[PDB]
Design a binder for these strands. Structure first.
Ligand code: MG
Ligand code: MG
Ligand code: MG
Ligand code: MG
Ligand code: MG
Ligand code: MG
Ligand code: MG
Length: 45
RNA sequence: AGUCAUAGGUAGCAGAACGUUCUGGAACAAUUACGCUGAAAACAGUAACAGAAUUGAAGCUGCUAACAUAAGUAACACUAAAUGGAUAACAUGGCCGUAAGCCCAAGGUUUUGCAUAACAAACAGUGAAUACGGUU
């Protein structure tokens, strides 16, 4: 559900102009973001 | 056309001229000029006669613009410290660590991402779905 080289900071991400997401934008800056996946109840980091 | 007389000058006064732009007299540079000199000067070598002037500039610590001088001079000394053939990913060393870390506010308003030069800004990027802040 996460791309951990991007999370630790050692890979480029989807939307690479962000570089420091808030609580939301973690879901959409993930390189492994699947649109067909359901959306979680709280949308955490 | 031969004799005589006069000719230092500030302030000031008087007389004679040169030059710039424009106009009148129908039109004086379509096809340029260029023998390099002439004149006492202002100057002349693309009319002349009159007229109208925002009419003459080394000289106002004048204004504007350009270009020099000082001069390749001063400066590139607040800080932690760098090394390996790279402002390196790797390795070694060091500095902060109530900050030189992290999260926001005010303010800024695209300053944010992409190419081992390149033709790349012309292209991208900010998602309210936890009773996030506002609007009340
Ligand atoms: Mg005299
Ligand atoms: Mg005398
Ligand atoms: Mg005439
Ligand atoms: Mg005048
Ligand atoms: Mg030098
Ligand atoms: Mg180095
Ligand atoms: Mg702001």
């Amino acid at each position: 559900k996460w791309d951990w080289k991007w999370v630790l900071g050692k890979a480029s991400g989807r939307k690479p102009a962000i570089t420091r997401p808030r609580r939301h934008q973690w879901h959409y800056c993930n390189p492994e973001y699947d649109p067909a996946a359901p959306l979680p109840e709280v949308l955490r980091s």
